[PDB]
Every structure is written in C-alpha cells, then in structure tokens.
Short mmCIF file of C-alpha atoms and ligand atoms in Angstrom, two decimals:
data_model
loop_
_atom_site.label_atom_id
_atom_site.label_comp_id
_atom_site.label_asym_id
_atom_site.label_seq_id
_atom_site.Cartn_x
_atom_site.Cartn_y
_atom_site.Cartn_z
CA UNK B 1 0.14 68.29 236.91
CA UNK B 2 3.34 67.54 235.00
CA UNK B 3 1.16 66.71 231.98
CA UNK B 4 -0.63 70.03 231.47
CA UNK B 5 2.49 72.24 231.55
CA UNK B 6 3.65 73.80 228.27
CA UNK B 7 7.07 75.14 227.28
CA UNK B 8 7.08 78.94 227.54
CA UNK B 9 8.85 79.23 224.18
CA UNK B 10 5.77 77.85 222.42
CA UNK B 11 3.73 80.85 223.56
CA UNK B 12 3.57 84.39 222.16
CA UNK B 13 1.63 87.05 224.09
CA UNK B 14 -0.09 90.05 222.51
CA UNK B 15 -2.68 92.68 223.44
CA UNK B 16 -4.93 92.64 226.50
CA UNK B 17 -8.43 91.39 225.70
CA UNK B 18 -9.94 92.05 229.12
CA UNK B 19 -9.46 92.09 232.88
CA UNK B 20 -10.51 89.12 235.01
CA UNK B 21 -10.31 88.61 238.77
CA UNK B 22 -6.66 88.53 239.89
CA UNK B 23 -5.06 89.27 236.52
CA UNK B 24 -5.43 90.44 232.93
CA UNK B 25 -6.45 88.28 229.97
CA UNK B 26 -4.43 88.54 226.77
CA UNK B 27 -4.49 87.30 223.19
CA UNK B 28 -1.70 84.99 222.12
CA UNK B 29 -0.28 82.41 219.73
CA UNK B 30 0.34 78.80 220.75
CA UNK B 31 2.54 76.68 218.50
CA UNK B 32 1.06 73.18 218.47
CA UNK B 33 2.73 69.78 218.08
CA UNK B 34 1.68 69.63 214.41
CA UNK B 35 3.77 72.69 213.57
CA UNK B 36 0.83 75.07 213.15
CA UNK B 37 0.03 78.02 215.43
CA UNK B 38 -3.29 78.53 217.20
CA UNK B 39 -4.91 81.74 218.45
CA UNK B 40 -5.40 81.51 222.21
CA UNK B 41 -6.39 83.49 225.30
CA UNK B 42 -4.00 83.68 228.25
CA UNK B 43 -5.01 84.35 231.86
CA UNK B 44 -2.11 86.01 233.71
CA UNK B 45 -6.16 72.97 237.40
CA UNK B 46 -5.01 69.68 235.88
CA UNK B 47 -8.54 68.37 236.39
CA UNK B 48 -9.89 70.97 233.95
CA UNK B 49 -7.81 69.32 231.23
CA UNK B 50 -9.62 66.06 231.97
CA UNK B 51 -12.87 67.84 231.10
CA UNK B 52 -13.99 67.00 227.57
CA UNK B 53 -17.28 68.39 226.27
CA UNK B 54 -18.18 70.66 223.32
CA UNK B 55 -20.18 72.87 225.71
CA UNK B 56 -17.31 73.26 228.18
CA UNK B 57 -14.21 75.32 227.45
CA UNK B 58 -11.13 73.12 227.17
CA UNK B 59 -7.84 73.76 228.94
CA UNK B 60 -5.06 73.89 226.34
CA UNK B 61 -2.40 73.96 229.05
CA UNK B 62 -0.53 76.23 231.45
CA UNK B 63 2.82 78.03 231.33
CA UNK B 64 5.01 79.53 234.05
CA UNK B 65 7.17 82.58 233.37
CA UNK B 66 10.10 83.69 235.53
CA UNK B 67 10.29 87.48 235.75
CA UNK B 68 13.54 89.45 235.83
CA UNK B 69 13.54 89.18 239.62
CA UNK B 70 12.75 85.46 239.50
CA UNK B 71 9.16 85.89 240.67
CA UNK B 72 6.99 83.11 239.21
CA UNK B 73 3.95 84.17 237.19
CA UNK B 74 1.74 81.21 236.04
CA UNK B 75 -0.46 81.51 232.95
CA UNK B 76 -3.53 79.53 231.88
CA UNK B 77 -3.92 78.90 228.14
CA UNK B 78 -7.49 78.84 226.80
CA UNK B 79 -9.02 78.85 223.29
CA UNK B 80 -9.68 82.15 221.49
CA UNK B 81 -13.40 82.79 220.95
CA UNK B 82 -13.66 85.52 218.30
CA UNK B 83 -17.43 85.89 218.75
CA UNK B 84 -16.82 86.66 222.42
CA UNK B 85 -19.03 86.25 225.47
CA UNK B 86 -22.75 85.56 225.08
CA UNK B 87 -23.91 88.47 227.25
CA UNK B 88 -22.24 90.98 224.93
CA UNK B 89 -23.44 89.10 221.85
CA UNK B 90 -27.07 89.37 223.00
CA UNK B 91 -26.78 93.14 223.39
CA UNK B 92 -25.13 93.62 219.99
CA UNK B 93 -28.00 91.75 218.32
CA UNK B 94 -30.34 94.53 219.46
CA UNK B 95 -28.35 97.00 217.35
CA UNK B 96 -27.87 97.31 213.59
CA UNK B 97 -24.47 96.42 212.08
CA UNK B 98 -24.20 93.74 214.78
CA UNK B 99 -25.65 90.24 214.31
CA UNK B 100 -29.24 89.86 213.10
CA UNK B 101 -32.28 89.66 215.36
CA UNK B 102 -31.81 86.39 217.24
CA UNK B 103 -35.01 84.33 216.96
CA UNK B 104 -36.50 82.29 219.82
CA UNK B 105 -35.21 79.05 218.29
CA UNK B 106 -31.60 80.22 218.45
CA UNK B 107 -32.03 81.60 221.97
CA UNK B 108 -33.31 78.25 223.20
CA UNK B 109 -30.32 76.53 221.60
CA UNK B 110 -28.04 78.79 223.64
CA UNK B 111 -29.83 77.59 226.77
CA UNK B 112 -29.56 73.94 225.70
CA UNK B 113 -25.82 74.30 225.08
CA UNK B 114 -25.29 75.72 228.57
CA UNK B 115 -27.51 73.03 230.08
CA UNK B 116 -25.47 70.36 228.30
CA UNK B 117 -22.26 71.91 229.60
CA UNK B 118 -23.52 72.01 233.18
CA UNK B 119 -24.95 68.51 232.96
CA UNK B 120 -21.41 67.35 232.21
CA UNK B 121 -19.87 69.20 235.16
CA UNK B 122 -22.70 68.24 237.52
CA UNK B 123 -22.11 64.54 236.82
CA UNK B 124 -18.50 65.00 237.96
CA UNK B 125 -19.69 66.78 241.12
CA UNK B 126 -17.91 69.98 240.07
CA UNK B 127 -19.41 73.28 241.21
CA UNK B 128 -19.28 76.28 238.86
CA UNK B 129 -19.90 78.99 241.49
CA UNK B 130 -20.14 81.79 238.90
CA UNK B 131 -22.49 80.86 236.04
CA UNK B 132 -23.76 83.85 234.07
CA UNK B 133 -24.22 85.00 230.47
CA UNK B 134 -21.01 87.02 230.74
CA UNK B 135 -19.16 83.79 231.59
CA UNK B 136 -20.52 81.87 228.59
CA UNK B 137 -18.40 82.01 225.42
CA UNK B 138 -19.39 81.72 221.76
CA UNK B 139 -17.41 79.39 219.52
CA UNK B 140 -16.88 79.74 215.78
CA UNK B 141 -19.75 77.31 215.17
CA UNK B 142 -21.96 79.59 217.30
CA UNK B 143 -22.35 76.88 219.94
CA UNK B 144 -22.09 78.04 223.56
CA UNK B 145 -19.67 76.73 226.18
CA UNK B 146 -19.41 77.54 229.90
CA UNK B 147 -16.26 79.07 231.37
CA UNK B 148 -14.79 81.03 234.28
CA UNK B 149 -15.01 78.30 236.92
CA UNK B 150 -22.56 88.78 241.51
CA UNK B 151 -25.27 88.92 244.19
CA UNK B 152 -28.08 88.75 241.63
CA UNK B 153 -26.95 85.28 240.51
CA UNK B 154 -26.36 83.72 243.94
CA UNK B 155 -29.03 81.37 245.30
CA UNK B 156 -30.97 82.40 248.41
CA UNK B 157 -29.42 79.68 250.58
CA UNK B 158 -25.94 80.59 249.32
CA UNK B 159 -26.44 84.13 250.61
CA UNK B 160 -27.67 83.21 254.10
CA UNK B 161 -24.94 80.59 254.59
CA UNK B 162 -21.80 79.49 252.74
CA UNK B 163 -23.64 76.42 251.45
CA UNK B 164 -23.23 75.78 247.73
CA UNK B 165 -24.27 72.76 245.66
CA UNK B 166 -25.25 71.94 242.08
CA UNK B 167 -28.71 73.21 242.99
CA UNK B 168 -27.06 76.60 243.44
CA UNK B 169 -25.67 76.35 239.92
CA UNK B 170 -29.20 75.53 238.79
CA UNK B 171 -30.39 78.78 240.36
CA UNK B 172 -27.72 80.76 238.52
CA UNK B 173 -28.65 78.91 235.33
CA UNK B 174 -32.23 80.09 235.73
CA UNK B 175 -30.98 83.66 235.85
CA UNK B 176 -28.80 83.04 232.79
CA UNK B 177 -31.90 81.82 230.94
CA UNK B 178 -33.54 85.11 231.90
CA UNK B 179 -30.61 87.16 230.57
CA UNK B 180 -30.94 85.29 227.29
CA UNK B 181 -34.72 85.58 227.04
CA UNK B 182 -34.46 89.32 227.70
CA UNK B 183 -31.43 89.68 225.41
CA UNK B 184 -29.06 91.03 228.04
CA UNK B 185 -31.14 92.79 230.71
CA UNK B 186 -29.62 93.15 234.16
CA UNK B 187 -31.52 90.89 236.61
CA UNK B 188 -34.09 92.47 238.94
CA UNK B 189 -34.56 95.95 237.42
CA UNK B 190 -35.42 98.51 240.10
CA UNK B 191 -33.80 96.33 242.77
CA UNK B 192 -30.34 97.04 244.19
CA UNK B 193 -27.82 94.42 245.34
CA UNK B 194 -28.13 95.14 249.07
CA UNK B 195 -31.90 94.60 248.79
CA UNK B 196 -31.67 91.21 247.08
CA UNK B 197 -31.69 88.93 250.13
CA UNK B 198 -34.83 90.49 251.62
CA UNK B 199 -36.37 90.66 248.15
CA UNK B 200 -35.95 86.93 247.50
CA UNK B 201 -36.70 86.02 251.11
CA UNK B 202 -40.12 87.65 250.75
CA UNK B 203 -40.83 85.28 247.86
CA UNK B 204 -40.21 87.61 244.91
CA UNK B 205 -38.52 86.26 241.77
CA UNK B 206 -37.45 87.41 238.30
CA UNK B 207 -40.51 88.51 236.33
CA UNK B 208 -41.62 86.98 233.03
CA UNK B 209 -40.31 88.74 229.89
CA UNK B 210 -42.96 90.19 227.55
CA UNK B 211 -42.56 87.87 224.55
CA UNK B 212 -41.47 84.85 226.60
CA UNK B 213 -43.50 81.64 226.35
CA UNK B 214 -45.32 80.39 229.45
CA UNK B 215 -43.64 77.01 229.04
CA UNK B 216 -40.23 78.67 228.94
CA UNK B 217 -40.87 80.80 232.02
CA UNK B 218 -42.03 77.72 233.93
CA UNK B 219 -38.68 76.05 233.27
CA UNK B 220 -36.53 78.95 234.50
CA UNK B 221 -38.88 79.59 237.43
CA UNK B 222 -38.39 76.04 238.70
CA UNK B 223 -34.72 76.95 239.19
CA UNK B 224 -35.60 79.54 241.85
CA UNK B 225 -37.58 77.38 244.28
CA UNK B 226 -36.64 78.20 247.88
CA UNK B 227 -35.67 74.64 248.83
CA UNK B 228 -32.73 73.54 246.63
CA UNK B 229 -34.07 69.97 246.58
CA UNK B 230 -37.21 71.19 244.80
CA UNK B 231 -35.10 72.45 241.89
CA UNK B 232 -34.67 70.17 238.85
CA UNK B 233 -31.29 68.75 237.83
CA UNK B 234 -29.43 69.95 234.74
CA UNK B 235 -30.27 66.67 233.00
CA UNK B 236 -33.95 67.43 233.57
CA UNK B 237 -33.70 71.08 232.52
CA UNK B 238 -31.76 70.13 229.40
CA UNK B 239 -34.45 67.72 228.22
CA UNK B 240 -37.23 70.20 229.02
CA UNK B 241 -35.52 72.87 226.91
CA UNK B 242 -34.81 70.37 224.14
CA UNK B 243 -38.43 69.20 223.99
CA UNK B 244 -39.71 72.78 224.06
CA UNK B 245 -37.38 73.63 221.18
CA UNK B 246 -38.50 70.71 219.02
CA UNK B 247 -42.13 71.70 219.60
CA UNK B 248 -41.57 74.90 217.60
C1 MH7 N 1 -13.88 83.35 230.04
C2 MH7 N 1 -13.08 82.34 229.26
C3 MH7 N 1 -11.99 82.98 228.39
C4 MH7 N 1 -12.07 82.48 226.93
N1 MH7 N 1 -11.06 83.15 226.12
C5 MH7 N 1 -11.41 84.37 225.42
N2 MH7 N 1 -11.51 84.38 224.08
C6 MH7 N 1 -11.85 85.51 223.41
C7 MH7 N 1 -12.12 86.71 224.11
C8 MH7 N 1 -12.52 88.07 223.52
O1 MH7 N 1 -12.70 88.93 224.36
N3 MH7 N 1 -12.71 88.49 222.12
C9 MH7 N 1 -12.55 87.66 220.93
C10 MH7 N 1 -13.12 89.87 221.79
C11 MH7 N 1 -14.61 89.78 221.32
C12 MH7 N 1 -14.85 90.29 219.92
C13 MH7 N 1 -16.31 90.06 219.48
C14 MH7 N 1 -12.01 86.64 225.53
N4 MH7 N 1 -12.27 87.80 226.40
C15 MH7 N 1 -12.17 87.63 227.82
C16 MH7 N 1 -13.54 87.14 228.32
C17 MH7 N 1 -13.55 87.02 229.84
C18 MH7 N 1 -13.10 88.29 230.52
O2 MH7 N 1 -12.93 88.03 231.90
C19 MH7 N 1 -11.78 88.83 229.96
C20 MH7 N 1 -11.78 88.93 228.45
N5 MH7 N 1 -11.66 85.48 226.13
CL1 CL N 2 5.63 86.65 224.48
CL1 CL N 3 -19.83 89.82 217.57
CL1 CL N 4 -30.93 96.04 228.65
CL1 CL N 5 -37.50 91.03 237.29
MG1 MG N 6 -15.50 86.54 233.93
#
C-alpha cells in the first residue's frame, strides 16, 4: 500500500465531527498536488482506493502519525460531506428551518444512488457488512454514496450463523429503503433487539409505511425473503427502483 500513503505534513487536523468504532472522526485540511487545500474527514485499505464510483465514498489516502512516545497512530483520509449522513438529513426534513419536505421522487433517487453504489461493490465481491441510512453520506450535489465498510439490519441467516454474503447486504438495503420511506423511523417499532431473531423467525417483517406505494413496498419486501437465494441482486433492485421512478 505504498501508493495510498500521504505525507503527514500535508494534513491539518481540527475539531471532532463524531465518534466511530475504534476512534474519533475529525475535520481537516488536505493540501493537494495542485497547491489547493481540500476539506476532509479523518478517521483516527489500499483496495478501497481502487474503488471508483460516484455512489461510493472515495479514499483520499492514509497518514501515519508517530506520537511523543513513538506509538504509531494511522489515519484514514475521507472527503468532507457538509450535508452529512442521510439518516440525519431525513429527520431534519421533518422540521422547519431544515431542508424542505422531501418528495417521493427525491426519496426514490436516494434509494437508486445506494443501489448503484452497492451494485458496484457487489460486482467486486466486496461485502459491506453494515449498510444503513446512518452510513450513507450526502454529497454537495445531493447524490448519496455508501460508506463505513445493529441487530435490526442483520439478515436472519446472519444472526443464526456467521454466514454473510451479498444477499445479506440486500437485506440491510431493504431496511435502508424503509428508513428512507419512513423518513428516519427506527426499524421494528415496539420490538426490542433481543426479540428480533424470534420475531423474524416467525415470519414477521417490516410493515408498510402509510403513504408508501404498493410497488415500492414489494421491492423492499423482496429483500427480506428467508432464503437468501430468493432475494434479488442489487442490479435487479436498482433497475426496479429506476423504472418505478420514471413511472411517476
Ligand atoms: C462515514 C464516512 C465519513 C465521511 N466523512 C464525513 N464528512 C462529514 C461529516 C459531518 O459529520 N458533517 C459535515 C456535519 C454535518 C452537518 C450537516 C462526517 N461525520 C461523521 C459521520 C460518521 C460518524 O461515524 C462520525 C461523524 N463524516
Ligand atoms: Cl494537525
Ligand atoms: Cl443539513
Ligand atoms: Cl421517527
Ligand atoms: Cl415495522
Ligand atoms: Mg458509522
């Protein structure tokens, strides 16, 4: 990975934007090769840089800092998304001052973007393992891209065993569609995490939102079929969403 590494001097770190897993995420400035500086986010691997898709977050590079004691502390440089995560954006839209009421057309486009992003990763046999609205970021052109690659998002087979495939990502995508259609509801209202396995095992699934089209609910429902092989691929789901969108 001698290609992805960036000189520490080219990076300036600022405030903390949020906590994530095993370390804090911070704002920063990255001086580029063209002399200009770019706003970035820094998580305090080489294959991710090979990823290239407008609906997938790009790796800008990584830096390694040596602390006063010589302890190494690696840092992952990612683009700065001022509009933030999609999950939070959906909730803000429900309030005044925040963005306007997001129409169905725009909501579907969010789903398409995510489907396009996953289609790209699925073709490279890369598993996401944590797809959710909170892990989808909004770019300055208001297009969505997947990032950050949780019991209520994990597929039924992935709970029973440690088996995980693209069909598991499809399951989580179905839930993400539901978050979007409901504008940020927590999955399975009235159901607690420790009850999820028995809840799904008994055949229960996420219920249809009030103003959600039958055609749309059919798409997301197909993601939750018990047998992973019965679930459609991302390339299928993407075209279904696209056709449904153009029909409006
Ligand atoms: C998950 C991929 C990280 C992408 N980088 C990034 N960019 C911007 C923000 C952010 O929080 N902003 C602009 C504030 C929103 C104002 C509307 C950001 N936040 C992180 C998201 C993921 C979380 O684990 C830590 C905070 N990340
Ligand atoms: Cl710094
Ligand atoms: Cl916002
Ligand atoms: Cl809610
Ligand atoms: Cl539900
Ligand atoms: Mg996260």
